[PDB]
Curated annotation (Swiss-Prot):
The gene is rub. This is Rubredoxin. The keyword Electron transport applies. It comes from Pyrococcus furiosus (strain ATCC 43587 / DSM 3638 / JCM 8422 / Vc1). It comes from the Archaea. Extremely thermostable, being unaffected after incubation for 24 hours at 95 degrees Celsius. Rubredoxin is a small nonheme, iron protein lacking acid-labile sulfide. Its single Fe, chelated to 4 Cys, functions as an electron acceptor and may also stabilize the conformation of the molecule. Belongs to the rubredoxin family. Residues 2-52 form the Rubredoxin-like domain. Keywords: Electron transport, Iron, Metal-binding, Transport. Binds 1 Fe(3+) ion per subunit. InterPro entries: Rubredoxin, Rubredoxin-like_dom, Rubredoxin_dom, Rubredoxin_ET, Rubredoxin_Fe_BS. The keyword Transport applies.
């Protein structure tokens, strides 16, 4: 699955890992993260992530 970078701090949201400590099971696509999910490192909103692909 895809990976997304936090353009603030460099955290990688890896869809295969999810974010279970913050309520997100492995395999959750970035689009399906709740609108108010934030970077677990710096708190950046979803708007500050970019998908790692061409
Ligand atoms: Fe961040
Ligand atoms: Na933190």
């Amino acid at each position: 699955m895809a990976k997304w970078v936090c353009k603030i701090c460099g955290y990688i949201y890896d869809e295969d890992a999810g974010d279970p400590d913050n309520g997100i099971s492995p395999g959750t696509k970035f689009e399906e993260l709740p609108d108010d999910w934030v970077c677990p490192i710096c708190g950046a909103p979803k708007s500050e992530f970019e998908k790692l692909e061409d």
